[PDB]
Amino acid sequence: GAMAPSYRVKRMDIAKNDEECVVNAANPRGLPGDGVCKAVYKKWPESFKNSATPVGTAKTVMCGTYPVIHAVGPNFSNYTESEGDRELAAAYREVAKEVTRLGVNSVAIPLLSTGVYSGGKDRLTQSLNHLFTAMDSTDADVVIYCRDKEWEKKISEAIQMRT
């Protein structure tokens, strides 16, 4: 575990993370995809061997000894708000199980079911709160990666307000 488990946020490419493992915002078919998924594919393509997994699940594949946790959030274009919410919370629960199993002291994590899976809605708060619900019982240092300047501020405020 980390001596004083923390949450942090950085605005940069998660492929340049300084953590012991990464969470990919994966598609269910293990395809290179776009956005975070494509950056992850470029950096750790070996981690896409048999990475396909259903919505609401996480599947870890090693790139060397570096664990890539492929977490499949729902595409809110396809799911109802109710069913998508349930699957999004489930994907993060599976990430917490994998982070725990791996014994890492840190993890780099993107906000699942944002961007191309958001169904054109702002899901920062929904996705971040499911992240916290799953990760709060873990003792890994969590570093959230984002790309938007306004999202960085909102995530940073949400972290700071619970300390």
Ligand X SMILES: C[C@@H]1CN(C(=O)c2cnsn2)[C@@H](C)CO1
Known binding-site residues for ADP-D-ribose equal 13, 27, 35, 115-117
Beta carbon nearer to Cl ion, 17 or 118: 17
**Per CB under 5 A, 2 contacts Cl ion:** no
Q: Hunting for tokens 């870890």 — which residue is that?
A: 60
Tell me which residues touch ligand X (CB under 6 A).
Answer: 114-115, 118, 120-122, 147-148, 151
Binding flag, residue 42, Cl ion (CB under 5 A)? no
Sheet holding 58-63, edge to edge: 7-11, 141-146, 106-110, 22-25, 66-71, 58-63
User: What does the block give as tokens for 135?
Assistant: 């990760």
Of these partners, Cl ion, ligand X, none, which one is at the site of residue 2 (CB under 5 to 8 Å by kind)? none
Separation between Cα atoms, residue 7 and residue 57, nearest integer Å: 22
- Which residues have CB under 8 Å from 37's CB, separation 6+? 24, 25, 26, 27, 31
Tokens of 134: 């799953």
| Least distance between ligand X and beta carbon 88 (Å) | 13
Select from ligand X, Cl ion, none the partner in contact with residue 114, using the beta carbon and a kind-dependent cut-off of 5 to 8 Å: ligand X
Cβ 111 to ligand X, closest distance in Å?
A: 7
Partner whose binding site includes residue 115, from ligand X, Cl ion, none (CB under 5 to 8 Å by kind): ligand X
Q: Where are the beta strands (DSSP E) in 14-128?
A: 22-25, 58-63, 66-71, 106-110
From the list ligand X, Cl ion, none, partner contacted by residue 13 (C-beta under 5 to 8 A by kind)? Cl ion
Interface with Cl ion (CB under 5 A): 12-13
